[PDB]
Amino acid sequence: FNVAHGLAWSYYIGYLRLILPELQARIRTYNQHYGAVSQRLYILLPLDCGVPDNLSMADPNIRFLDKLPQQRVYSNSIYELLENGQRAGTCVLEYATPLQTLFAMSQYSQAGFSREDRLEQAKLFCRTLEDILADAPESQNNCRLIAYQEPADDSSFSLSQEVLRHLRQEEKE
Amino acid sequence: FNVAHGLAWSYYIGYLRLILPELQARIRTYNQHYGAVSQRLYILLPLDCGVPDNLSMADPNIRFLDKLPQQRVYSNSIYELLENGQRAGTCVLEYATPLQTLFAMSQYSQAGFSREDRLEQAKLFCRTLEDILADAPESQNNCRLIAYQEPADDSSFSLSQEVLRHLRQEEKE
């Protein structure tokens, strides 16, 4: 019923608690061998549940650089963030794919998931996941949640500016 | 609340609907190049939610043969089933890992998941998943659910005999 609660806990148990303790070392290995990539996994949480099929970012100010090397195969992508033509940040960035699952459940008649419940379940997914990570041992400062809703009147949104805002806070603290 | 419903739908959407349409071809490729492996993915559903940490099968009558080759990396294992010292079947076999997630949720104080609710949620996971697969296009006769509960008084159970019963039905039909 609160489908988002189970999906947050599963995403933590079967993915984040397994990948996050080895992330710092794969990043630190990249920053020796292959401007430096920042230290955390940045997780994109579009509250509209819109995740591209190829997990590929439309925004040309978010430009693919490289895959992180391995420490179970994990494909995690490093992106450069551009601002008025300038390289302004570099980080490991990806979508919270369970939001895509909520979207897909909403389309299937047998799932009992109303289309108009997507925003509420996305917000519950985000809140549950933030509460888990607040008491999570494997999170030693190695992921950041980026939750966002684009404006209601089709007014322009910059995903790159959204990401950069979060990065610059981490430089400040 | 019915956490098992969301986990069944996610397991279908984010794994089974992606792996199952390519399974027949990876199996048919193995049966040319590397006794023949049977055609379906056999999914183990222990209603006690006990899934080994190394996904490795204790029963010495279920003996690892090989990994299936690739067509996103999928590690799927081929096992030989032994009966009174004789090779009696060969299939692609694995645990429904969301049952392990139910078990783990039951251990975490913050999850709101009572230990004594594991059997009920496992049964709901199995029922939901069987209903999904009944109307599923990517299931063209390419997976089989094997649900089981060991006896209540610590009386002996054979997982190999359980698997072989299901295989021999498929030879009959």
Ligand SMILES: CCc1nc(C)oc1C(=O)Nc1nc2cc(C(N)=O)cc(OC)c2n1C/C=C/Cn1c(NC(=O)c2oc(C)nc2CC)nc2cc(C(N)=O)cc(OCCCO)c21
């Ligand atoms: C996700 C669908 C699902 N929903 C439920 C309840 O269960 C499953 C499930 O069991 N899926 C699954 N089984 C797999 C088996 C196998 C194999 N045979 O080798 C392979 C699988 O993919 C490769 C399987 N996959 C899908 C994802 C599993 C792990 N994983 C995740 N996980 C989630 O997004 C997730 O979301 C929720 C709500 N729960 C979870 C935890 C399963 N994200 C990942 C990102 C990456 C990456 N960027 O490269 C790599 C991952 O897996 C590496 C393979 C390690 O096994 C990832």
